Design a protein around this nucleic acid. Structure first.
Lengths: 234, 230, 233, 231
DNA sequence: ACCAAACAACCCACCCA
DNA sequence: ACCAAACAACCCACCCA
C-alpha cells in the first residue's frame, strides 16, 4: 500500500569511458589464453547472434557463457534492467569478446604456417561471407567484418571503417552505427588526428572493399549475366 | 553451466522437390482437398506468424481437416535446425499444395471447377491475377512454386523479376529461384537454353494489372480525369 | 491428438450484394426510438475510440452504447478473426457512421427546429480538421463522415471529391478510393456516373477545393508570423 | 453492453496558467526535487509515457528517484480526454516544470549550476548535438513542456520547432501548441508581432547546431563528407 | 468491400544520452 | 552503448474482394 504504480531509476553511464581496447585485449589474453583455440573461436563467431538474443532474454547481471571449452564470464547489457549498471573497463561484453577473438585470429595466424592453416580452415565470419569475402581476400579485410574489430583499426588497416562506410553508401545502414568506429584510435593517433591525416589510406581501403562482390555474392557469373539480360543491376 | 554454444557443420543439398512432393502426397494425400487447400492459402501468413511466435520445433497444424506436422524454421531459436529432405516446412507445404492444385485441375472437369472455385491465392489477387489469366501463372504466385519452375512455366521467376523491376524488391530475395532447376536442367544450363520461354513468361506477367489492381479501366480513366494516376 | 494450430478461414465463396438504402431503412426501423442528436453526437465523437476498442475485443459481435443508443455491431477489426462475412443486415462501425450521417441529413429536413438541434449538437471531427463547418453546407459537412460514400447522391458527390482531395493534397494511398469508386449514385452504377456525372463531380471538387484544409487551427496572425519564417502553413 | 460511450462536452478554452501551476508544483513537491531525480526523469520520460499509454488508471503515481508524484493519465486512447484541472499535473507539464526548475536552480549560484549541468541530460538536445556549453536556455529548451516558459527560455522552444519544420519536415500542426503560449505577459497575437527579431536571433542560433544525430565532430562531418556521406 | 485521416480542450513522435 | 546486418544449408517481405 502507498506504493507507486511505476518506479524509475538512473542510468548514469558513462562518466569517462576510459576504456582501452589494447589493454582489454592483453588482460583478456592473460586471463583466458590457455583455452583459446581455433575450434572455440569458430564456435563463438557462429553462435554470437544467438548468444546475443540469449542475453537480451536473460535477467542476470554477469552471465558465464561457454563456447567449446572456452568459458568466459561476461557482463550482460542487453536487457534494459541490467545495463543500467555501467560496464567497467575490465569487463567483457559480447562485442568486446568478438573484437578480442578477431585480433586473436589475427596474431595466431602470424604465429606460423600451421596456425595459419588451422585458423583459415576453421574460422568463419558469416558477415564477411555474406559479402563474398574469403580468407584469400586478405586476413585483415576478412577479419574486419567481425563485430568489435573497429577496436583495432590499425591492425585491420582501416577495414572495419571502410566496411561501415560501404554499408552506409550501398546497404543504407543508419549513420549511428558508425559512431563506434569514429571515436576509435588508429595506432597512437586520435580520431581528430587520423580523420584529417589518414584520409588517403582510408580511401585506399575503401577501394579495396569496393572490389568485393558485396550484394553480388552469391550469384554465379551466369546468374549475373542472366539478370543483366533482364535489365536488373545486380 | 551456464549457457552452452557449439559447432554446427557444412553440408551440401540433395533435396529433390519432385521426390519430396511424391512422398508428401503418399503421406497426407487422403486429406488433401480443395476445401482444406483453400483454408491453407488463406491462412498461410497467419500460420507463419504463429510459427514465428511458437518455441516448438515441430508443430501440428490443421487446415480444415488436413493435419500436417511441419518443421518450424521461422523462430530465431529454431532457425538453426537442419531440414531433412522428408521434412515439411510452410514454404514446402505451400509449394506442394500449389503443384497439387496443378495436377488436380488436370484430373478432369469437376476437379478443375472445384479447385478454381474454392482456391484463392491472395498474393495473386493482390496483383489482379485471376484463374482466367491461367492456371500456371495464377499458381505461380503461391510461395514455394519456384520448386516447380517447369510446371509453372517459369512464371515464378518472371514474377520475382517483376517484383524487382516494378516494386523495387531487393535482389537478394531472388537467390532461391536462381538456384532452382528446370526439370533436370541446372540453373547454369537453363539460364542460357531457356531464355525464350522466360521472356514469354515475363511478357505475360507484364500484361497483369499489377499496381493498377482493384480499379477497372473506367475507374482509372475517371481518376485520370482528376489528375490521379492511377 | 492434438494439433498446435488449427485453421479454417473460410471467407467469401462469392460476392456481396449489399444495398445501403435498405440497410438504412432497417437500421432506422430497428433503432429509431433512441436516435437523437445527442446520441449521434456521442457516436461521431467516439468513432475512433470505438474502433480501437473493437480491435481489442475477441467477440465477433460487440454491443456498443452511445448515450442511450444501444447497437449490436459486427467486429471486423481484429487481424485475428478478419474472416469476415458481413451480412447485409449487419451493422459495422463504418455502416453505422454512414447511417447516422444520413439520419442527420433527413432530420435536418424535418424542419427549422430539428435543423437547429442537429446543427447545435452534432460535430464531425474529420470535417472540422479541414475547417469545414455546418455553414459550408449540410451535404458537404456531413460528407466527411466515414460511410457517407454509401449515399453519394444525398451528399452530392462530396465524399468522392473529398477522397480525391485527400489523395492529391495529403498523399492518401489511392487504394482507399476503391470503395467510393464502386458506389452507386441514385440508380446509376459507377460505370455510368463516371462518364455521365462529371459536371456535378467537378462542381463538388471545386467546392471542396475552396476549403482551408491544412490551414485549419491557425489564427491569421499565426499564419503571418509563420509566413515570415519561410514556413507556409 | 460491452463498450459504452459518453457525451464529451465541448469543452471550454484553457484558463491554465503555467506560472501558477509551477508555483503549486514547487510548493507541493519542491522538497523532493534534486538534480538526480530530474536526470532520472529526463532519461525515463519516453518509458514513463509508454507505461502510461499502457495503464488504464485515471490517476497514476510515478516515482523518479525519490520524487514521487501523482499524475493525471491522459495517455490511453480510452481516457485521453478525462478532466485535467489547472492544478493537475501531466507528464508534459511535469517535464516543463522540471526544465524550469533546472533554470532557476542554475540561477541560484555557481555550485548548483555545476551540479545540474553535470547530472542533467536532455536526450532530445543531445540528439541534435546541443550541450550545456551551447547555452542553458537553449539546452533546456529541448525539454518537452519548455514552451510553457518562452520568456525564461528566450523563444528557444519556438525556434527549435521552426528548425524542425524547416529541416526535418516536422508536421506543422505540432506547432499549434507553442503558438498559444505567452511570453511574459504578452499574448501570442502580441508577441508574434512585437518580438519577431529576437525570434530570428534564436532561429539562427538553433540553425548553427550540428543537428546530425550527433555527436559527430565538425572534423567528423568533414571526414564523412569526403566519402559522399550526408550526416 | 470496413477503415489511414479526426472539433473544442492543449499533448503524443523525435528521445543513446 | 546498442536493437540493424550473419558461412554453408533453408524461406526472410509482399498478401482475395
Amino acid at each position: 500500500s502507498t506504493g507507486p504504480d511505476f518506479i524509475y531509476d538512473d542510468r548514469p553511464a558513462a562518466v569517462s569511458s576510459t576504456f582501452n581496447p589494447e589493454k582489454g585485449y592483453m588482460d583478456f589474453i592473460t586471463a583466458y589464453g590457455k583455452n583459446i583455440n581455433a575450434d572455440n573461436v569458430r564456435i563463438f563467431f557462429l553462435n554470437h547472434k544467438k548468444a546475443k538474443d540469449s542475453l537480451k532474454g536473460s535477467p542476470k547481471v554477469e552471465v558465464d557463457l561457454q563456447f567449446g571449452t572456452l568459458r568466459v564470464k561476461v557482463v550482460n547489457n542487453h536487457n534494459p534492467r541490467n545495463r543500467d549498471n555501467p560496464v567497467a573497463d575490465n569487463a567483457i561484453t559480447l562485442h568486446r569478446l568478438s573484437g578480442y577473438l578477431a585480433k586473436w585470429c589475427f596474431d595466431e595466424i602470424d604465429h606460423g604456417q600451421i596456425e595459419e592453416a588451422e585458423v583459415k580452415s576453421k574460422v568463419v565470419i558469416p558477415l564477411a561471407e555474406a559479402k563474398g569475402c574469403k580468407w584469400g581476400d586478405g586476413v585483415a579485410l576478412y577479419l574486419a567484418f567481425a563485430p568489435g574489430a573497429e577496436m583495432f583499426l590499425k591492425d585491420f588497416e582501416f577495414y572495419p571503417l571502410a566496411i561501415d562506410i560501404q554499408r552506409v553508401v550501398k546497404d543504407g545502414m543508419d549513420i549511428t552505427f558508425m559512431r563506434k568506429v569514429l571515436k576509435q584510435r588508429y595506432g597512437t593517433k586520435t580520431a581528430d588526428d587520423w580523420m584529417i591525416s589518414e584520409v588517403t589510406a582510408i580511401q585506399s581501403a575503401v577501394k579495396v572493399v569496393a572490389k568485393l562482390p558485396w550484394a553480388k555474392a552469391g550469384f554465379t557469373a551466369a546468374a549475373k549475366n542472366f539478370l543483366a539480360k533482364f535489365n536488373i543491376s545486380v
